């Protein structure tokens, strides 16, 4: 998200990191993308635009947010 | 002109389509000999694609950027800008085919319902009666008026079968 | 009656059958559990080590395969302890009750677990 | 006319038997038991499947639920023109009669039955279903 | 002859000969007046 | 157990009777039609839920009906 | 000792339009008239059913015979078409000519409404729809040179249809055999073998060796087609005769003096194919029906008829008798002459594998000239005859349950063969439907495996020729084995009967027409899935057999019938148990099985046989992508579906946008199916009563009440376009690709 916001055009968004024993090598290069540590999947849903637009710049924005509703639940 | 479209006479990309299908034509065509049975039938299609165009250009259709005739649906439209013998005049050219049809089947049913066995009347037809009632029916609209205005088009509620509610 | 057939009713079939494990009577439930534990337990590494991701790995093929049919007889420990709590909860031979099947789930896991082991021991 | 009572050693037709017979259920809960008297010896149809020779004289056959039972009666009612009857027979042993009930067919009234499940209204008059509802069960118009 | 005529009334019968002038009707009127798409 | 109802049109005609396939109903006497005989239902717990004498009944509308209900190894019609 | 002899029955029906005028006379229930809808398709439904029109077995035989006369008419009219559009609606006499550029073409369509698009250039100066059913080939092996010779064929195959129509009227209305006639299997049989197919075969060995063989001879050598000598001047000539076949110079005294090695020069034995056409030898055909004609006529005369010397069918069932299966083959000669439905089953199921033989032996040995290099007709005639093979069989399941309901009796059949196989049927199904689902994992669970594989960056882990590896060895084995016949095992003849065992490609025109076919484990895979799609079908159409009067379910199910849809949601719902949906499931499993047969062959053929030979070696049209593409699911998806699809999908504009057109109109079909197959007839009942009520308001309700279809019609109307839509879309595919590369 850090990194998105700087050049939202150019950049995929993230969703989560995959941890799948059954990969192959091939398939662990295939899904390294977007500059991150190993294999990513891409975002699809929007909240990348949607947290932006609201306000939501670093991490810990959204790390308090996640705690919050944790809470709310 | 109308919805941004353009008279195909007047349309660069409807002339381009022309040349097209004629180039595809005349391609085949001189594989053949100048009078063999292949180009006589070829020759009988160009003839009639040349004539295809000049008909549609010469109805004052419309034509998009396609370069392919639209057709104009609104009544006020067709008839304000003469349009109106793409649907609206077949709109009533139908409709009393339709009815004719419709009509004289409906005359048929009634007809054998006061025969002594129906059911036996619809599947092998009475061919006098239908042929009859054939001609009959030119003056459906009429007829169909009529019996609207007299009230015996329409069954009464009492005598229609309903489930329970 | 039941449609009579050699397979279904022979001599030298049934007597294979009475020495099996399974069927000999007279037996504590528990060594019972070893006995049929330590044969599928043996067998079940073959297929792991031969044809597992890490198959072609010189040492370590050995190892990943066998510690795999560990895994598998683990599995299998825990299906036939629950199959013996929903089947006995309230009849000739003590193994098919409440008490017996426990002791036979316990046999099958230290049986397969040492005849996975044993296994290994053979190939290294 | 009083209740028969089952002969267990009563002879069974000639068959050889098959796979469509009784199952394990026949050891715990219940299974069926059908006996007549054959005029001659004939061939017949078993509802599980293949032909069975009666015997002259008193039968028997098991079956595994009661619409075998009652499957092998229209058969040997209908072509063969005999008079069996069943029982329902427990493993503890127990034996229950049934079919027929009381002696005589259901097909032909008899007096000294009660009449059960009878509505006296029209499938029409049933209440709607909101008049049974919180009842304490899923309960049908029709059962009240 | 009576009985044969019967026949050629029933409904089999006088759906073919009825769709069979009226696809000759309409495949006629198309060969005479190829392609039309407006009244005009 | 199904639920098998008689209702008070029936006609004494014996039809479902005949078709039921396990005996679940019978002819009793009665005075409120020409045969002086309706159909009971004193054996539900054999019943299947076939509704063959659905099929037989020839009153409009039926004057036997089914409503399939709880299951059970007989209602389930099982051999094992 | 009952005499064999002719026995009709005078005049037994009267020819009148009286009855053409009363729909349903033929059964009782129908014969009162219509009162709703069901009766009109109940009316159709029922036509053909004799056995239950009746219970007189003489009148059902009576009326089988005749429409069977009806059927042999038509065929004759349809065969007459194709003979008479060949001669006046066909480029042939061209084609004669230049065999390798012309494309054979048969039909001509009307300039209306632009559909003379369709009219394609196929060479000769001709435009018309190019056709694949090889008659162009067939033609010119016989020796036909001329549209003359065509257009007599077809007066000839017009004449025969009325002698055809004539033969059924007079042995119905003016002299039907009776019962007895009917019955005897040993006569039949004796003329069958040897007077229908030996005689048969004898007299076209004649029309090969007088004909066929001198025409084709010559025609190979590269004589102009008119400049040939016309067949009666080869008969009448042995001169003619002698120059091309000096054999011929001898007479027929080496035939009565044994001396039959004087025939070697046009009764040969060389195996392969013929280089020049690509076909096999057409010596080699007439040695073959000549071998034929004396091994038929040999069995001709087997059965005792009328003068003592022959076998009773009877007693050699009788005697074969074990001490496994009890009495054995009794009471099966008494079936199988008193039961139609118990004949037809198993003809059908012969029959129907016949018609799968054919395909896979006319590819492999083509037998016409210039067969192989036409892709177009090798596809579509393998594929018709495996589709035709499939339903025959399917067939055969469906009147063996017709004839366990209605012509079964427990009192003819005790402890015999027939009888001990009901007894186990649990047994044979619960085996049956083991293996099923043992070939599903192991063959199907294959694919996904290496999809799964693959997927995952792991070809290393793949079941193929690069990995872990499944070759066919027994089936390699068989192909050296066949190979290597001519050396040891078959030393006269000259060369293998086929050139896929191994071998040296055979080109004609610069195209191949046969060459070694390699099995790998693409096709051990693919092998092992028409070994599961077939035990399927075996497993439901022989379940509904076995289970067809009773089950641990239904234990009356004889008494309901063979087709009726349910016995009622009692016992949990007892939807589809009859028989008749035995069939109706066994015919989804049947086209699913034989979809991958026909995809299977196409793939297969482009990728490793068909192709264009140059100066480098061949170049096949899909490139040999078969071996490593087709070991996944998404290898057909990509490679075969999608990329072959391409010529279908651009077909318009051309002369093969009619395959587009019908690409898309079967696609159409076959989904409207899943609307009757999907529903029950109880939502559309209910929507009629709203659509009546609109018709009753407006005075215009029809007498007939309209009725929702049946329950078993709605599943008889599903299936059936289901199928004429599946398949549709794949003939539509075919022809489009192969025609446009092929
Ligand atoms: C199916 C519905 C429908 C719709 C969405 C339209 C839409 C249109 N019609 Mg059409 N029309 C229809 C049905 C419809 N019509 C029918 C059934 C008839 C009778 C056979 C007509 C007869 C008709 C005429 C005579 C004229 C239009 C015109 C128009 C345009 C502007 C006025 C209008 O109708 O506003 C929206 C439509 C409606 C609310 C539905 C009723 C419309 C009535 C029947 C016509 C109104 C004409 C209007 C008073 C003209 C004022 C001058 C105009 C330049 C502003 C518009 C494109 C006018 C035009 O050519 O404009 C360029 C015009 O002169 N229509
Ligand atoms: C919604 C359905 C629909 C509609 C509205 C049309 C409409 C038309 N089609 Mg199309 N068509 C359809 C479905 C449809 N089609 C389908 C499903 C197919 C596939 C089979 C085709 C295939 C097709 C072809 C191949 C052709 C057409 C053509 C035509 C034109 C025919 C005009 C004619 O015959 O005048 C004849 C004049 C008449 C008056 C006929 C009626 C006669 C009665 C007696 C009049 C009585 C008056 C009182 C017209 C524009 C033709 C064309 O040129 O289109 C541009 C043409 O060549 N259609
Ligand atoms: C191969 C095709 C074929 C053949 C050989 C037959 C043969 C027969 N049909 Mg069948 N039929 C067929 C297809 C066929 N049908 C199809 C596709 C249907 C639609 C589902 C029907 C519907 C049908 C009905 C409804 C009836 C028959 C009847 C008959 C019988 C008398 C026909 C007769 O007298 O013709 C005489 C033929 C000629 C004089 C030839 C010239 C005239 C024709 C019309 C051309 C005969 C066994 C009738 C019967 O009695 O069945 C027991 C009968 O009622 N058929
Ligand atoms: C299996 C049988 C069969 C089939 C499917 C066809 C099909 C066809 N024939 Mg052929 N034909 C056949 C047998 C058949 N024929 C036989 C046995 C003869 C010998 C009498 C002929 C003689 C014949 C002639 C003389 C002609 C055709 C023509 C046609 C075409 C148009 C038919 C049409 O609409 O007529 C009109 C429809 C009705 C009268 C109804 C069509 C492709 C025509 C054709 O291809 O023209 C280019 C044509 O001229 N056929
Ligand atoms: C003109 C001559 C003639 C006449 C008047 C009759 C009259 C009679 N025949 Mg006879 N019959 C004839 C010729 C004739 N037959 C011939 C040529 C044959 C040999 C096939 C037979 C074989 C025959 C049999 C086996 C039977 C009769 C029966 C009958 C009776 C009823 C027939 C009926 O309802 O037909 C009406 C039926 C039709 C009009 C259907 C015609 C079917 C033909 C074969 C055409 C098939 C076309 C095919 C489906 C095309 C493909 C369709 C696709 C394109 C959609 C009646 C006494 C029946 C009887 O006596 O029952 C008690 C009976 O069982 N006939
Ligand atoms: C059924 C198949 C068949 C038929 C019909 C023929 C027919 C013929 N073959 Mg062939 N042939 C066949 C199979 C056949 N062959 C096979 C399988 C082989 C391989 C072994 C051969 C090998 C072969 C050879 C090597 C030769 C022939 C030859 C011939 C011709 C003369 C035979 C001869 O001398 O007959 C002798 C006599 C008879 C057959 C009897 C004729 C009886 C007549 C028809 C009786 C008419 C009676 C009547 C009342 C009179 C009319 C009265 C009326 C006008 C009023 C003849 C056209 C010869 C030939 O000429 O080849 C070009 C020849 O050399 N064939
Ligand atoms: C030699 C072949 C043969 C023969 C002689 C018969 C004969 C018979 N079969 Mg059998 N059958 C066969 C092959 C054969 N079958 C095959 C191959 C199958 C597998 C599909 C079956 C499956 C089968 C079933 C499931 C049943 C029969 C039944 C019957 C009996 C009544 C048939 C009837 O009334 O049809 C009347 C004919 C029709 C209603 C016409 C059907 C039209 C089809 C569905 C059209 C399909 C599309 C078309 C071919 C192409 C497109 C058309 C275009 C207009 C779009 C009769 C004894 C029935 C019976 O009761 O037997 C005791 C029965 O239930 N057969
Ligand atoms: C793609 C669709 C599809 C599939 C997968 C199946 C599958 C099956 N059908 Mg069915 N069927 C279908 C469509 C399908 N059918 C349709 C459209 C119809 C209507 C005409 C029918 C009608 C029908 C009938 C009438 C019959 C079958 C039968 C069968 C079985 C065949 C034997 C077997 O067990 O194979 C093995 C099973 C498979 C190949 C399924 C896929 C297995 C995967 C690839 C591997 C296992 C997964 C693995 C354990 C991982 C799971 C992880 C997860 C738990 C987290 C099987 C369960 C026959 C049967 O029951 O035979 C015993 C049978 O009689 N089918
Ligand atoms: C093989 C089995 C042959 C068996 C064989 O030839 O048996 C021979 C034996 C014949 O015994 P009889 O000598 O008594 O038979 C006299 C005959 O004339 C028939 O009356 O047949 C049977 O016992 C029938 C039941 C066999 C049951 C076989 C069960 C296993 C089926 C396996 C199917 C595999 C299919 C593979 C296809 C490639
Ligand atoms: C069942 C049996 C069916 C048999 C049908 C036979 C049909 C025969 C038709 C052809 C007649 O011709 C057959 O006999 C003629 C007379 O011997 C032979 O004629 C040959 O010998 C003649 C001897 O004088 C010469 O004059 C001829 O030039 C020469 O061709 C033909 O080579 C042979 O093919
Ligand atoms: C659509 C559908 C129907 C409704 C379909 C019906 C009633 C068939 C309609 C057939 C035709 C279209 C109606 C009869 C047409 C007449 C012959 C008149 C035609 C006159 C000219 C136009 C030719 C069922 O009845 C049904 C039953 C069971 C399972 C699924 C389904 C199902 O899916």
Not at chain 7, 365 to 369: A, F, G, L, N, T
């Given at each position: 998200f850090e990194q998105w916001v700087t050049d939202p055009v150019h950049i995929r968004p993230i969703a989560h990191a995959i941890w799948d024993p059954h990969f192959g090598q091939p398939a662990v290069e295939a899904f390294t993308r977007g500059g991150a540590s190993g294999p990513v999947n891409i975002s699809t849903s929007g909240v990348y635009q949607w947290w932006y637009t609201i306000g939501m710049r670093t991490n810990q924005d959204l790390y308090v947010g996640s705690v919050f509703l944790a809470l709310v639940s | 002109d109308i919805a941004g479209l353009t008279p195909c006479s007047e349309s660069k990309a409807y002339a381009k389509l022309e040349k097209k299908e004629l180039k595809t034509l005349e391609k085949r065509l001189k594989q053949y000999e100048a009078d063999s049975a292949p180009a006589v039938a070829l020759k009988a299609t160009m003839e009639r694609t040349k004539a295809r165009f000049a008909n549609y250009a010469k109805a004052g259709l419309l034509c998009g950027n396609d370069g392919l005739p639209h057709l104009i649906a609104d009544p006020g439209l067709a008839l304000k800008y003469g349009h109106a013998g793409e649907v609206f005049i077949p709109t009533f050219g139908f409709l009393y085919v339709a009815g004719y049809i419709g009509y004289v089947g409906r005359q048929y049913l009634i007809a054998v319902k006061g025969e002594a066995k129906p059911t036996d009347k619809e599947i092998i037809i009475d061919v006098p009666l239908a042929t009859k009632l054939a001609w009959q029916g030119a003056g459906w609209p009429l007829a169909a008026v009529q019996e609207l205005q007299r009230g015996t088009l329409l069954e009464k509620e009492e005598n229609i079968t309903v489930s329970p509610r | 009656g039941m449609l009579e057939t050699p397979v279904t009713s022979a001599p030298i079939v049934a007597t294979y059958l009475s020495n099996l494990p399974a069927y000999r009577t007279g037996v504590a439930p528990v060594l019972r559990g070893v006995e049929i534990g330590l044969a599928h337990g043996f067998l079940l590494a073959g297929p792991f080590i031969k044809?597992?991701?890490?198959?072609?790995?010189?040492?370590?093929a050995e190892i990943a395969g066998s510690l795999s049919a560990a895994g598998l007889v683990l599995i299998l420990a825990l299906c036939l302890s629950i199959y013996g709590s929903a089947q006995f909860q309230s009849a000739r031979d003590p193994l098919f009750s409440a008490d017996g099947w426990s002791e036979f789930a316990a046999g099958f896991l230290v049986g397969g677990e040492a005849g996975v082991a044993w296994a290994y021991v053979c190939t290294q | 006319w009083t209740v028969p009572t089952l002969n267990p050693d009563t002879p069974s037709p000639i068959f050889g038997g098959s796979t469509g017979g009784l199952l394990r259920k026949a050891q715990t809960e219940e299974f069926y038991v059908i006996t007549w008297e054959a005029k001659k010896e004939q061939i017949f149809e078993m509802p599980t499947g293949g032909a069975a020779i009666m015997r002259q004289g008193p039968n028997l056959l098991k079956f595994g639920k009661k619409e075998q039972c009652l499957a092998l009666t229209t058969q040997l009612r209908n072509k063969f023109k005999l008079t069996p009857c069943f029982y329902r027979v427990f493993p503890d042993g127990k034996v229950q009669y049934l079919h027929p009930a009381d002696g005589v067919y259901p097909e032909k009234v008899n007096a000294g039955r009660v009449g059960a499940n009878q509505n006296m209204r029209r499938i029409g008059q049933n209440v709607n279903p909101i008049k049974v509802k919180f009842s304490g069960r899923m309960m049908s118009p029709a059962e009240i | 002859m009576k009985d044969f005529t019967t026949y050629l009334s029933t409904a089999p019968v006088i759906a073919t000969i009825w769709f069979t002038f009226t696809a000759g009707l309409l495949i006629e009127i198309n060969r005479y007046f190829p392609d039309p798409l407006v009244f005009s | 157990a199904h639920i098998v109802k008689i209702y008070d049109t029936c006609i004494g005609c014996t039809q479902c009777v005949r078709a039921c396939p396990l005996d679940v109903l019978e002819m009793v006497p009665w005075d409120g039609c020409k045969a002086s005989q309706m159909a009971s239902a004193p054996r539900t717990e054999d019943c299947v839920g076939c509704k063959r004498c659905e099929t037989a009944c020839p009153t409009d509308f039926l004057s036997v009906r089914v409503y399939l209900g709880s299951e059970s190894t007989r209602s389930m019609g099982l051999s094992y | 000792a009952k005499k064999v002899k002719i026995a009709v029955d005078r005049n037994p029906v009267e020819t009148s339009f009286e009855k053409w005028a009363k729909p349903g006379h033929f059964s009782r229930t129908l014969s009162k008239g219509p009162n709703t809808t069901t009766w009109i398709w109940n009316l159709h439904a029922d036509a053909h059913d004799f056995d239950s029109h009746t219970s007189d077995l003489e009148e059902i035989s009576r009326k089988v015979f005749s429409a069977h006369f009806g059927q042999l008419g038509i065929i004759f009219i349809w065969l007459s078409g194709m003979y008479f559009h060949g001669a006046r609606f066909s480029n042939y006499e061209a084609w004669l000519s230049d065999p390798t550029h012309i494309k054979p073409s048969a039909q001509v369509v009307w300039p209306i409404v632009g559909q003379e698009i369709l009219n394609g250039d196929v060479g000769g100066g001709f435009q018309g729809i190019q056709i694949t059913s090889g008659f162009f080939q067939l033609w010119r092996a016989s020796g036909i040179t001329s549209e003359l010779q065509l257009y007599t064929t077809a007066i000839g195959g017009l004449v025969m249809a009325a002698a055809m129509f004539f033969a059924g009227w007079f042995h119905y209305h003016k002299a039907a055999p009776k019962l007895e006639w009917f019955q005897n299997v040993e006569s039949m049989l004796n003329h069958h073998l040897g007077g229908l197919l030996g005689l048969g075969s004898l007299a076209w060995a004649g029309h090969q060796i007088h004909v066929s063989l001198p025409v084709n001879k010559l025609l190979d050598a590269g004589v102009d087609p008119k400049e040939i000598p016309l067949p009666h001047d080869l008969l009448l000539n042995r001169a003619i005769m002698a120059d091309l076949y000096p054999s011929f110079a001898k007479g027929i005294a080496p035939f009565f003096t044994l001396n039959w090695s004087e025939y070697s020069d046009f009764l040969?034995?060389?195996?392969?194919?013929?280089?020049?056409?690509?076909?096999?030898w057409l010596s080699d055909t007439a040695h073959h029906h000549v071998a034929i004609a004396v091994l038929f006529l040999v069995a001709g005369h087997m059965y005792r008829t009328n003068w003592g010397i022959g076998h009773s069918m009877k007693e050699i069932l009788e005697a074969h008798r074990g001490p496994f299966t009890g009495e054995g083959h009794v009471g099966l000669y008494e079936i199988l002459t008193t039961s139609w439905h118990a004949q037809l089953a198993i003809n059908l199921a012969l029959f129907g594998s016949l018609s799968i033989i054919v395909a896979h032996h006319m590819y492999a040995?083509?037998?016409?000239?210039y067969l192989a290099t036409d892709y177009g007709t090798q596809l579509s005639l393998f594929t018709h005859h495996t589709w035709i093979g499939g339903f025959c069989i399917v067939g055969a399941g469906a009147h063996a349950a017709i004839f366990m309901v209605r012509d079964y009796d427990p009192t003819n059949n005790y402890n015999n063969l027939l009888d001990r196989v009901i007894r186990h049927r649990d047994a044979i199904i619960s085996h049956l439907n083991w293996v099923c689902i043992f070939l599903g994992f192991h063959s199907f669970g294959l694919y996904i495996h290496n999809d799964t594989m693959s997927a995952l960056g792991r070809p290393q882990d793949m079941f193929s020729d690069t990995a872990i590896q499944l070759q066919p060895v027994f089936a390699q084995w068989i192909q050296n084995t066949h190979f290597l016949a001519?050396?040891?095992?078959?030393?006269?003849?000259?060369?293998?009967?086929?050139?896929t065992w191994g071998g040296d490609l055979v080109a004609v025109g610069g195209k191949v027409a046969m060459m070694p076919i390699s099995l790998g484990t693409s096709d051990f895979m693919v092998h092992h899935i028409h070994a599961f799609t077939i035990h399927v079908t075996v497993l439901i159409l022989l379940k509904g057999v076995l289970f067809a009067r009773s089950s641990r379910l239904i234990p009356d199910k004889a008494n309901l019938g063979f087709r009726f849809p349910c016995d009622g949601p009692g016992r949990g719902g007892t939807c589809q148990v009859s028989a008749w949906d035995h069939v109706f499931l066994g015919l989804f499993w049947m086209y699913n099985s034989l979809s991958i047969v026909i995809f299977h062959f196409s793939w297969k053929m482009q990728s490793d046989v068909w192709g264009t030979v140059t100066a480098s070696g061949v170049s096949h049209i899909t490139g040999g992508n078969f071996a490593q593409s087709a070991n996944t699911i998404n290898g057909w998806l990509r490679d075969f579906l999608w990329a072959q699809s391409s010529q279908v999908i651009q077909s318009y504009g051309s002369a093969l946008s009619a395959y587009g057109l019908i690409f898309l109109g079967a696609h159409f079909v076959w989904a409207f199916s899943l609307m009757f197959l999907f529903s029950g007839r109880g939502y559309w009942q209910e929507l009629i009563e709203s659509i009546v009520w609109a018709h009753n308001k407006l005075k215009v309700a029809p007498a007939i009440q309209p009725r929702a279809l049946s329950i078993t019609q709605g599943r008889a109307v599903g299936v059936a376009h289901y199928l004429l839509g599946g398949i549709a879309t794949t003939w539509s595919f075919f022809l489009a690709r192969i025609i446009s590369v092929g």
């Open positions: - | - | 044809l597992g991701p890490l198959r072609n790995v010189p040492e370590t | - | - | - | 040969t034995f060389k195996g392969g194919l013929n280089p020049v056409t690509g076909g096999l040995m083509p037998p016409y000239p001519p050396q040891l095992t078959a030393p006269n003849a000259l060369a293998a009967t086929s050139l």
